[PDB]
């Protein structure tokens, strides 16, 4: 129960659901290896969003849900690039859920 991934020969602790629990480091290799297992390729678009969540959660202590991410990325990335279809075209498994997975963030649902 709960497994460790292989990055640079280092054992990083991730939740068995595929979410990095050890947020005491996180390197690009972590996200890449996790993406490989999902067959999702990470372009500069993905990496911008991944780094965004990484930074956002680290500074704000807040994990942006799908309703929030779409707004934030819209202003951050460009003019109005934050589109629902765009997010689904990047993460076909679920925009916010897939992004945070690679960003090394825990399952974000919150008190709704």
Class of domain 1-41: alpha beta
* Fold matches, 1-41 and 42-112: no
Strand 19-20 relative to strand 10-15: parallel, antiparallel, unpaired?
Answer: antiparallel
Q: How far apart are CA 96 and CA 69, in angstroms?
A: 7
Domain boundaries, the chain: 1-41, 42-112
CB 100 within 8 A of CB 18: no
Tell me if 19 sits within 8 A of 101, measured CB to CB. Answer: yes
Q: Are 78 and 67 in contact (CB under 8 A)?
A: no
What number of other Cβ atoms are within 10 A of residue 6's Cβ?
Answer: 10
d(CA 26, CA 21): 10
* Technique used by the depositors: NMR
Secondary structure of 45-88 in HEC code, one letter for each residue: HHHHHHHHHHHHHHHHCCCCCHHHHHHHHHHHHCCCCCCHHHHH
42-112 has which CATH code?
1.10.10.370
DSSP at 21: -
Cα distance between the two ends of the chain: 29
Q: Which residues participate in catalysis according to the annotation?
A: 111
Strand partners, 3: 14
Q: Which value, to the nearest 10 degrees, does the dihedral of the CA atoms of residues 109, 92, 3, 19 take?
A: -30
C-alpha 101/C-alpha 110 separation (Å) is 16
């Amino acid at each position: 129960m709960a497994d460790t991934i292989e990055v640079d020969g280092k054992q990083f602790a991730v939740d068995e659901e595929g979410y990095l629990s050890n947020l005491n480091d996180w390197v690009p290799g972590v996200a890449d290896v996790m993406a490989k297992q999902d067959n999702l390729e990470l372009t500069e678009e993905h990496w911008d969003i991944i780094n965004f969540l990484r930074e956002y959660y680290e500074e704000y202590q807040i994990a942006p849900a799908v309703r929030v991410l779409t707004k934030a990325v819209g202003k951050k990335l460009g003019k109005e690039k934050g589109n629902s279809k765009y997010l689904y075209s990047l993460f076909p498994y679920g925009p916010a859920k897939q992004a945070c997975r690679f960003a090394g963030l825990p399952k974000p649902t919150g008190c709704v």
